[PDB]
């Protein structure tokens, strides 16, 4: 043919995979004192225009995604930002003379501690009642457990820890893809993609070993991993059925304010009303038996249909790795989930222990102090998936064992940013055509 001529095109819809900063979008609803919304970071959240593309098989990845690292450093930065202007408690690390309590049943326990404090005008100290748990006092009679580690800044009691959903909206000149294929397992080409301006509601919960209040997939309980062949690779699993967790804490927990120096109060747990029972969580055994049936009946597709056993999580770690750790309206539970894992191959109570001095929920160093909550604490919501690890070893053929380990906080956010990917837009494209410019 004839010699064609180059013709630029501005606005060609091509894209490359890139990495950039995103931002919030939430909604307004006063009392916006939330730790994760930083008092309504972007309170807009407009109408969600979603556009299909109908014709493109884009490759995705969830184990190389970038938005999970942005979400993780955003959450730890919002934590340390909200914790900053609250009361320090470095005058609390003192020698405590404690004794047991006796009003109710054994096997709970609490320690009735008293110390020299109430230091107000820098000259007068007082003997003060307080009522601490175990798991945050040690012997020498007693001191707090974090006094050989760092300082112990308490939370401001006006803020709350309810995980209101946030939405990551991309900046201009970038786009957020979204795989709609309901059987996209973990990674690869998704055949039917879509484009949104921003993601759905992401409740940024923090829960080990059983991720809560999640976005549950379809009736095929999906199995995600990096590769099943490696034994040290966390096997996420996602449900389709919201099994309920009726958790509670039975006592009444009067609060007692202590003045420390100038205007810095300190809230210590006073004398409770006098019914010491144990904190527990109920799950109905029928629906749990069925959802284990589904997870085990879609785990035999990945290897031979033989002898699946599950166990308690060999412990060590601390409570963060061994027990299901979560907070229920500002009170931090730790629940012994041995009683959910026996051998599936062919109502349930759970004892929960409560810590009060929490570590930095990933790191070592600074540690917060959760002030007590008045009344009876009771919160219910759904589980949405587990986090398992294979053991393997010399089990060359049978007795495959799974134990719900899993300790990192990133995998919770990989359980909802798997169907998303960020792309840059390169609007400038050239193409040979049959047009040539009128040269004057």
């Amino acid at each position: 043919a004839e010699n064609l001529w180059v013709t630029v095109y501005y606005g060609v819809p091509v894209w490359k995979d890139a990495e950039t900063t995103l931002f919030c979008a939430s909604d307004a609803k006063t009392e916006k004192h939330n730790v994760w919304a930083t008092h309504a970071c972007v309170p807009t959240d407009p109408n969600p225009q979603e556009i299909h593309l109908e014709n493109v098989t884009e490759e995705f990845n969830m184990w190389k995604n970038n938005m999970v690292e942005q979400m993780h450093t955003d959450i730890i930065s919002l934590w340390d930002q909200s914790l900053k202007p609250c009361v320090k408690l470095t005058p609390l690390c003192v020698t405590l003379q404690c004794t047991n309590v006796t009003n109710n049943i054994t096997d709970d326990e609490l320690k009735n501690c008293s110390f020299n404090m109430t230091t107000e005008l820098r000259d007068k100290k007082q003997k003060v009642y307080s009522l601490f748990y175990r798991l945050d006092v040690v012997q020498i009679e007693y001191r707090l457990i974090n006094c050989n580690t760092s300082a112990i800044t308490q939370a401001c009691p006006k803020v709350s820890f309810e995980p209101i959903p946030i939405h990551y909206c991309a900046p201009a000149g970038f786009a957020i893809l979204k795989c709609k294929d309901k059987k996209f397992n973990g990674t690869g080409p998704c055949p039917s993609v879509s484009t949104v301006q921003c993601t759905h509601g992401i409740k940024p919960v923090v829960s080990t070993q059983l991720l809560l209040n999640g976005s549950l997939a379809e009736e095929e309980v999906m199995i995600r991993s990096e590769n099943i062949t490696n034994n040290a690779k966390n096997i996420l699993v996602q449900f389709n059925t919201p099994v309920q967790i009726n958790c509670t804490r039975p006592n009444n927990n009067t609060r007692k304010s202590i003045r420390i120096g100038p205007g810095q109060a300190f809230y210590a747990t006073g004398d409770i009303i006098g019914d010491i029972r144990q904190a527990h969580c109920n799950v109905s055994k029928a629906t749990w038996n069925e959802t284990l049936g589904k997870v085990v009946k879609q785990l035999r597709k990945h290897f031979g249909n033989n002898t699946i056993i599950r166990f308690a999580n060999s412990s060590g770690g601390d409570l963060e790795v061994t027990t299901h750790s979560f907070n229920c309206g500002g009170e931090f539970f730790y629940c012994n989930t041995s009683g959910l894992f026996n051998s599936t191959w062919i109502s349930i109570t759970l004892p929960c222990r409560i810590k009060q001095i929490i570590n930095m929920w990933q790191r070592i160093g600074q540690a917060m102090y959760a002030p007590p909550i008045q009344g009876v604490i009771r919160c219910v919501s759904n589980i949405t998936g587990l986090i398992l690890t294979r053991d393997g070893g010399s089990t060359n053929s049978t007795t495959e064992t799974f134990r719900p380990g899993g300790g990192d906080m990133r995998d919770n956010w990989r359980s909802e940013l798997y169907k998303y990917k960020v792309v840059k837009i390169e609007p400038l494209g050239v193409a040979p055509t049959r047009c040539k410019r009128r040269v004057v």
Partner: protein
């Protein structure tokens, strides 16, 4: 927005029979959420996390949406979404069929075709836009428009309209 990015360039001839399938207005007007409220907040909070992150995202989008306007300025194409050039399809070695390209090939596959030599084309275009075209236009005024045409040496005008 992006609604036929997976189509072939013949079915994405459909895209550039509309506003390049709304790509440019989606570039600059998807700012409207962070344009609507970086300021609706009346709160102290004594420090700002987004005060650097949102600002960096914003000026990143602005400089990216100005480099392309300057590059269309440098090839005489400023304003025009689709314009033609005097640079020929050169010795550039992806010489192939017209009815293969604009009938059965997507924009992304086309980007995979000519991923090389793209900076060669970008360096090549302004050459014919400027180094002779601007110098011919500089010649075209240092001669009276209606006074040279008596010589019968009028080809210079013809030469400037063919080559």
């Amino acid at each position: 927005f992006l609604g036929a990015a997976g189509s072939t360039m013949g079915a994405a001839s459909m895209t550039l029979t509309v506003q390049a399938r709304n790509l440019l207005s989606g570039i600059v007007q998807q700012q409207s959420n962070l344009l609507r409220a970086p300021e609706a907040q009346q709160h102290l909070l004594k420090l700002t996390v987004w005060g650097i992150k949102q600002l960096q995202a914003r000026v990143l989008a602005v400089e990216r949406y100005l480099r392309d306007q300057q590059l269309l300025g440098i090839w005489g194409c400023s304003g025009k979404l689709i314009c033609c050039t005097n640079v020929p399809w050169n010795s550039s070695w992806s010489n192939r069929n017209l009815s293969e390209i604009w009938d059965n090939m997507t924009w992304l596959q086309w980007d995979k075709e000519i991923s090389n030599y793209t900076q060669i084309i970008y360096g090549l275009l302004e050459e014919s836009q400027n180094q002779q075209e601007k110098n011919e236009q500089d010649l075209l005024a240092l001669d009276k428009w209606a006074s040279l045409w008596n010589w019968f040496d009028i080809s210079n005008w013809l030469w400037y309209i063919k080559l």
